[PDB]
Ligand binder design. Sequence first.
Ligand SMILES: O=C(N[C@H]1CCc2cc(F)cc(F)c2NC1=O)c1nc(Cc2ccccc2)n[nH]1
Length: 266
Amino acid sequence: NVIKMKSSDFLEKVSLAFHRTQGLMIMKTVYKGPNCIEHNEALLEEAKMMNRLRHSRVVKLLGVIIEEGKYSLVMEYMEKGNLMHVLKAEMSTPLSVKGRIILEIIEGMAYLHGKGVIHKDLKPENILVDNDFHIKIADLGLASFKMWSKLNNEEHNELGTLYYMAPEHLNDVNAKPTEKSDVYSFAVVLWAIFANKEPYENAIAEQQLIMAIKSGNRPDVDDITEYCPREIISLMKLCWEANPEARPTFPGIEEKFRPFYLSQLE
Ligand SMILES: O=C(N[C@H]1CCc2cc(F)cc(F)c2NC1=O)c1nc(Cc2ccccc2)n[nH]1
């Protein structure tokens, strides 16, 4: 189960903090100011069910700081920051670690979809890396932490990439996300891994970009200088198909990618 951690346990709003017994952790204190004990029953329940998600490639919610007008979400430390951070970094990450990161993302996403979780906001900012270069899927924006997310955005507190978003979600906020909404996102994460930068230059995410994407525009494959195996380009094109029922399922992706990684990349 989850821990109902006290502020005291941590020796001297996102910040780093040392647990007396457990060790190193990251924390985002979402709430401050007045007390709102009316949501305090739910916030704990959302947290203990998010904690039910236990996979090697899925971030573990270690505990919650639930106190008088101060609410925090604590998780394990991922030393190497996020995926984009690792790719833009000075030391060039090799084709053998890239393909493994790709297998691990497939492993993590398939698990979530297994457990009925739809990420909704998959992107490199939500793919975290440990020292050994292993990844974990995170929900830093609380897109899946429904209660905690609005608590974070409320007026009683004192404190957005469209690039990875499926065309059916652009200009249509009332469309219910599917398992394929995560699959489009993945295909653009595939491109990002091989091009070592953000797609569609760096700007703007205005009505021009959005309309070009909904019509059929996808990231520039020819902007990948580095060697990219034929098979993984077929995959990104397959996954970012305009029609969601054209896009594969993650267990389907896994079935074809695992043998490929083994022979060609590992
Ligand atoms: O990301 C996660 N939890 C953060 C949220 C807020 C935050 C933002 C920060 F910038 C720094 C942080 F330390 C915190 N703390 C947390 O506990 C988290 N994902 C998962 C697994 C899962 C679930 C569904 C979809 C995908 C992934 N479990 N916890």
